[PDB]
Amino acid sequence: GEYPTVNEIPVGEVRLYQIADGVWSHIATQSFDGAVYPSNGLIVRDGDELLLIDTAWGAKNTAALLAEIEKQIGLPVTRAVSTHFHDDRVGGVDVLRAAGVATYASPSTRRLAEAEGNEIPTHSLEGLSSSGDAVRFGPVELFYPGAAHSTDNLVVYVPSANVLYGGCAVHELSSTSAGNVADADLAEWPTSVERIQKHYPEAEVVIPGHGLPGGLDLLQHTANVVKAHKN
Numbered sequence: 001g002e003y004p005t006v007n008e009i010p011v012g013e014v015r016l017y018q019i020a021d022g023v024w025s026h027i028a029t030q031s032f033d034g035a036v037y038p039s040n041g042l043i044v045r046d047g048d049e050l051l052l053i054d055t056a057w058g059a060k061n062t063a064a065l066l067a068e069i070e071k072q073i074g075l076p077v078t079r080a081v082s083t084h085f086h087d088d089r090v091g092g093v094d095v096l097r098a099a100g101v102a103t104y105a106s107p108s109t110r111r112l113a114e115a116e117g118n119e120i121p122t123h124s125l126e127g128l129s130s131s132g133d134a135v136r137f138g139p140v141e142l143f144y145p146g147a148a149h150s151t152d153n154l155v156v157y158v159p160s161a162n163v164l165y166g167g168c169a170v171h172e173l174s175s176t177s178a179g180n181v182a183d184a185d186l187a188e189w190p191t192s193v194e195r196i197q198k199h200y201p202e203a204e205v206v207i208p209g210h211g212l213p214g215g216l217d218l219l220q221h222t223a224n225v226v227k228a229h230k231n
């Protein structure tokens with residue numbers, strides 16, 4: 001019942017967590033540079049199909065994700081969106097693509113993934129290139145808030161449930177640092193978070209890219225930890 005944490009999930013196993021009717025997060029763990037990290041994605045019911053947001057950070061984790069979805073939900077994943085180019089978002093796209101899932105990302109994300117040597121979603125999402133842009137994609141809205149954790153980061157809103165999936169632009173409340181900032185724009189990040197706050201004032205659940213969901217306070221907390229990391 002509690003939201004599952006990094007030491008509770010062996011690398012290679014995937015958990016699902018019911019967020020709202022027709023909305024789950026997925027949680028998996030992965031090793032990177034000799035440390036183990038949890039990470040989140042989203043699953044949104046789309047009639048008798050499912051929309052997936054982000055991989056489970058790796059090929060075997062993503063295969064395990066598909067198996068867990070089949071076990072717990074039993075509807076086919078037909079489309080996936082990756083919310084930026086890092087491996088916790090796109091690692092596993094090749095698995096998805098071999099399992100019949102149509103994979104999508106912005107053109108920015110696709111370029112960055114290619115240049116990084118990461119797996120590359122098949123389809124480009126136009127209409128998201130300027131901050132404040134929004135497009136519909138099945139049962140969600142995709143929103144580009146501006147550069148933050150990465151220049152390409154997208155956020156996802158589930159209007160039926162008022163669920164805001166911030167991805168790696170949003171940190172959990174326990175965070176003390178701004179995470180992996182190698183590709184971040186620390187100066188623009190608080191402005192991008194303000195755009196999220198202004199666009200989604202009715203959000204009831206906010207899900208970070210890593211760690212525990214909460215409410216709207218995750219947004220201000222994120223701005224705070226980013227400003228303090230820069231400063």
Ligand SMILES: CC(C)c1cccc2c(-c3ccc(CS(C)(=O)=O)c(C#N)c3)c(C(=O)O)[nH]c12
Nearest residue numbers: 032086087088168171175176177178179180210
């Ligand atoms: C480039 C990708 C694949 C990657 C690799 C390894 C770690 C990360 C982290 C991360 C997340 C949360 C935390 C704890 S925190 C908020 O308290 O710093 C930490 C730490 N330490 C790292 C992120 C991220 O920030 O999106 N991406 C990562």
Ligand SMILES: [Zn+2]
Nearest residue numbers: 084086149168
């Ligand atoms: Zn990232």
Ligand SMILES: [Zn+2]
Nearest residue numbers: 088168209210
């Ligand atoms: Zn991340």
